[PDB]
Design a protein around this ligand. Structure first.
Ligand SMILES: CC(/C=C/C=C(C)/C=C/C=C(C)/C=C/[C@H](CCC(C)(C)O)C(C)(C)O)=C\C=C\C=C(C)\C=C\C=C(C)\C=C\C=C(C)\C=C\[C@H](CCC(C)(C)O)C(C)(C)O
Ligand SMILES: CC(/C=C/C=C(C)/C=C/C=C(C)/C=C/[C@H](CCC(C)(C)O)C(C)(C)O)=C\C=C\C=C(C)\C=C\C=C(C)\C=C\C=C(C)\C=C\[C@H](CCC(C)(C)O)C(C)(C)O
Ligand SMILES: CC(/C=C/C=C(C)/C=C/C=C(C)/C=C/[C@H](CCC(C)(C)O)C(C)(C)O)=C\C=C\C=C(C)\C=C\C=C(C)\C=C\C=C(C)\C=C\[C@H](CCC(C)(C)O)C(C)(C)O
Ligand SMILES: CC(C)CCC[C@@H](C)CCC[C@@H](C)CCC[C@@H](C)CCOC[C@@H](COP(=O)(O)O)OCC[C@H](C)CCC[C@H](C)CCC[C@H](C)CCCC(C)C
Ligand SMILES: CC(C)CCC[C@@H](C)CCC[C@@H](C)CCC[C@@H](C)CCOC[C@@H](COP(=O)(O)O)OCC[C@H](C)CCC[C@H](C)CCC[C@H](C)CCCC(C)C
Ligand SMILES: CC(C)CCC[C@@H](C)CCC[C@@H](C)CCC[C@@H](C)CCOC[C@@H](COP(=O)(O)O)OCC[C@H](C)CCC[C@H](C)CCC[C@H](C)CCCC(C)C
Ligand SMILES: *C/C=C(C)/C=C/C=C(C)/C=C/C1=C(C)CCCC1(C)C
Ligand SMILES: *C/C=C(C)/C=C/C=C(C)/C=C/C1=C(C)CCCC1(C)C
Ligand SMILES: *C/C=C(C)/C=C/C=C(C)/C=C/C1=C(C)CCCC1(C)C
Ligand SMILES: [Cl-]
Ligand SMILES: [Cl-]
Ligand SMILES: [Cl-]
Ligand SMILES: [Cl-]
Ligand SMILES: [Cl-]
Ligand SMILES: [Cl-]
Lengths: 258, 259, 259
């Protein structure tokens, strides 16, 4: 399959196309809004938190460009027994075996989610040890999930990588729910943290669910539905999450200064 | 050549399959042990050393799964003049030109090795400059080793990359043997450091040798033995190494405190 | 299109081959020269700058080896509307459609440019916030540049990434020209920083110009000429830039010794 065919496949499919191009527009508009909102920051620690946050939609716009252009999408055949094995996709007038694997999402999450975690950790006044733990295991979760999506030799290996990824995820969840909830009180950011933490935990839990229900998993959701589900999660987990963090940050630059 | 053909290819050859699936379980079992061993730590600095150390077997289980699943393995045709050139593999009933390239190892080494170094550097009370130097050259060592294995155009190029990788390695060896060995004194970990240090250097020194002997080098060793050589080296350079460091840490948390 | 075909295409193409092999040599000689020059450094901060600087030619030799070997080169077909669409390369013995894409340059810039910036920011006495910002957007610039060259589906998509990459570039430019220019005055390195600042801004502006003029862009410059333009830029932006920064550092260790 050609990159252009996958690019044409995205266009031609209103559902799939809208899920991608809307976030290219939204992520781009977010970057511009966030830069305008924080233009007045003077404190370097507050600025560090703002840059880290702004990088979230910066990575997002590139991720969606990679997906919509076909650069980071592949057509893969599922292993023996996989709920979607034997499926076909059809590019233009031709029909090919396999499923539309949008691995570009999983790959870029390894870049954007560490930035969400770094911004949140700093906001909560975390120490280096916890930031390092959250971030490394977070990256490990994103990479093993990518590996699971790219494995086509065995149906079991796929879910095994999915398990490894879930294990790394509980670590991140633990420091978010336990560790940082405490740190935030000592930092004077318990209020905004509890909000972002609640949002983060609930929205993030959605990704592995969507993964299991879409073509990658048990395939009960079509490609266009699974994509909008992720694009919807991103809109909250990234764009509104960042708007709320930066909205607070610009009104509380002094508290975050340290 | 599909991923499916490489997966089962690991089978039908218990010599190769064992070296892989065995470390998957040893890595996982090591992770469990370490987590319960370090349940007592409370010092943020001692906690850093532990997490850094625990990540080694974490990257290892994923690395072996990538290899075992056929995800990070390929069949490459060696260049003219290469000893393994003109070889076949046959992923089943059909035989194809090339050799079984397990690049999956070299790729993850750029992730695991930096963590081993992070742990050691912290133990010795190293400063940032030395940590930065060790980790950057260690990563360069791994990536060029990976490039060496993927180069199929020229035999001399493969060896040129090998040479570059060796130059980066001496940089790591130098900080281990000369720099940190001295920092460990001011940190008060010279004792445990010398131990881990001696272990690390001897074990790492074997990876390039294995590479040179395996199918990607002179090809005197079979993919099964080379895989076991590495698999054996990891058990020491990673798991047992992690245990020694962690064992010390749990018993001497106040030594590496400074928090 | 095999790696070998690419490796042989470079050879038998004097322009292209010379733009690659010459810098494998210049990078290597630069590494030796810089190590020799910095031998007497003792302050940890002074040595951080030096190591960060030396890593520039280390990444560079590996980059050029990757290109000369054919490992990081590919033949791609340009999208409709591209002034290089439907082009032929005549690779090996048979004419092949597409353009020789040396994407290995963009891939390694993501590793080398952050080191140039770390060295400069340190030289200017930058806080961690500006260093984080400069380096992350620099990496974003490089990765989206690589994505642009790797995009064959749409012509518009290629220039859009180029646009995103440019946006990231202005952040780096602003930090160099606005932020660090003022910081260097407090760090007592105003003179040398302003010099390296300018050399850097001028040479870096050269890369997107070459990208746009070369085969990746409007194609007014054939592959061998686009390659020499990049190789000429690297000699100034990397090797002589590093030579000048180290020349200053070794005569002013105390000025940047700080902590
Ligand atoms: C808006 C935007 C993109 C919009 C896209 C749109 C609308 C696409 C529409 C597509 C359509 C309709 C498609 C239709 C299809 C076919 C249609 C057809 C006609 C063909 O048929 C169909 C029908 C579905 O099939 C991008 C912005 C993109 C924006 C970018 C790339 C911005 C970059 C900014 C940066 C990078 C600033 C950074 C600033 C910083 C880091 C500032 C720093 C300060 C701190 C500085 C310090 C510390 C260094 O001193 C701070 C205080 C934090 O601000
Ligand atoms: C146990 C495990 C895996 C076990 C696997 C086994 C037994 C596999 C067996 C396979 C077989 C027999 C195959 C046979 C083949 C048949 C093949 C065929 C296809 C036919 O079937 C045949 C026959 C040869 O051919 C994994 C764990 C995997 C575990 C993972 C991925 C864990 C992640 C979590 C961590 C590492 C927590 C970390 C917690 C930390 C760092 C907590 C923090 C504390 C500090 C707190 C702070 C910093 C947050 O404040 C600290 C003190 C550091 O602990
Ligand atoms: C010189 C060199 C290479 C030269 C290559 C040449 C000339 C190639 C020529 C090719 C030709 C002509 C080809 C022709 C083709 C065919 C021709 C034919 C005839 C065959 O037909 C044709 C015609 C085009 O088609 C490499 C060096 C290569 C060098 C390397 C790889 C060096 C590594 C060193 C390190 C990594 C040290 C590092 C030291 C450090 C970091 C020291 C640290 C100090 C601080 C210490 C601390 C922090 C640890 O405490 C410090 C102060 C920073 O120095
Ligand atoms: C973050 C995102 C948004 C930015 C984009 C970067 C990266 C994800 C793009 C890599 C894309 C490829 C895997 C795409 C496959 C396209 C196929 C359907 C077509 C193959 O047909 C093309 C062949 C011709 O020979 O070229 C064969 C060569 C082709 C061109 C593949 C070359 C692949 C190399 C091995 C991959 C490089 C990837 C980078 C190391 C990734 C991340 C780096 C970090 C620092 C951000
Ligand atoms: C890290 C360890 C512990 C876990 C391992 C996970 C991961 C690193 C493995 C990725 C595997 C692939 C490179 C395997 C290629 C196998 C080929 C022989 C078959 C390709 O057939 C698939 C084609 C169909 O077109 O898809 C074309 C797309 C194919 C699948 C290539 C996709 C390549 C992307 C661009 C590479 C992503 C790698 C990450 C950048 C590595 C590290 C990232 C850091 C920031 C954590
Ligand atoms: C560190 C600095 C100093 C040194 C820089 C050196 C750099 C130039 C080398 C990196 C080179 C690789 C990206 C090359 C891949 C070449 C491919 C286009 C063609 C492979 O041809 C083989 C096919 C056969 O089918 O397998 C198709 C599948 C193949 C085998 C997959 C290869 C996948 C690789 C392992 C993907 C990981 C790439 C790393 C994330 C890149 C940079 C990492 C940073 C953190 C150092
Ligand atoms: C901007 C993107 C965000 C916030 C992405 C978040 C992604 C996750 C929390 C993904 C988790 C997964 C698992 C826990 C199991 C395996 C599969 C994944 C990758 C979907
Ligand atoms: C867990 C894995 C470990 C500790 C791996 C260590 C690997 C090395 C020290 C590899 C070194 C190599 C060279 C010095 C030369 C070229 C080839 C390599 C990659 C095998
Ligand atoms: C050693 C390499 C150096 C100094 C490389 C510098 C590269 C740039 C400044 C590249 C910038 C680019 C853009 C701003 C737009 C898109 C294309 C690029 C990647 C050429
Ligand atoms: Cl600042
Ligand atoms: Cl993303
Ligand atoms: Cl802690
Ligand atoms: Cl590993
Ligand atoms: Cl030092
Ligand atoms: Cl480079």
């Amino acid at each position: 399959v050609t990159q252009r065919e996958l690019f044409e496949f995205v266009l031609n499919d209103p559902l799939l196309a809208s899920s991608l191009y809307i976030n290219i527009a939204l992520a781009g508009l977010s970057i511009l809004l966030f830069v305008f909102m924080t233009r007045g920051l003077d404190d370097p620690r507050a600025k560090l938190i703002a840059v880290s946050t702004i990088l979230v939609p910066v990575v997002s716009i590139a991720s969606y460009t990679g997906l919509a252009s076909g650069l980071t999408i592949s057509v893969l055949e599922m292993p023996a027994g996989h709920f979607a094995e034997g499926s076909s996709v059809m590019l233009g007038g031709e029909e090919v075996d396999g499923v539309v694997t949008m691995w570009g999402r999983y790959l870029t999450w390894a870049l954007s989610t560490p930035m969400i975690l770094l911004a949140l950790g700093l906001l909560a006044g975390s120490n280096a040890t916890k930031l390092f733990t959250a971030i490394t295991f977070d990256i490990a979760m994103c990479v093993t999930g990518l590996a699971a999506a790219l494995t086509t030799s065995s149906h079991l290996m796929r879910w095994f990588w999915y398990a490894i990824s879930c294990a790394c995820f509980i670590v991140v969840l633990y420091i978010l729910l336990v560790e940082w909830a405490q740190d935030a009180k000592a930092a004077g950011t318990a209020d905004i943290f509890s909000t972002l933490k609640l949002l983060t935990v609930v929205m993030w839990l959605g990704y592995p669910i969507v993964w299991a229900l879409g073509v990658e998993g048990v395939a009960v959701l079509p490609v266009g539905y699974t994509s909008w589900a992720y694009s919807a999660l991103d809109i909250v987990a990234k764009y509104i999450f960042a708007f709320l963090l930066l909205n607070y940050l610009t009104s509380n630059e002094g508290v975050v200064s340290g």
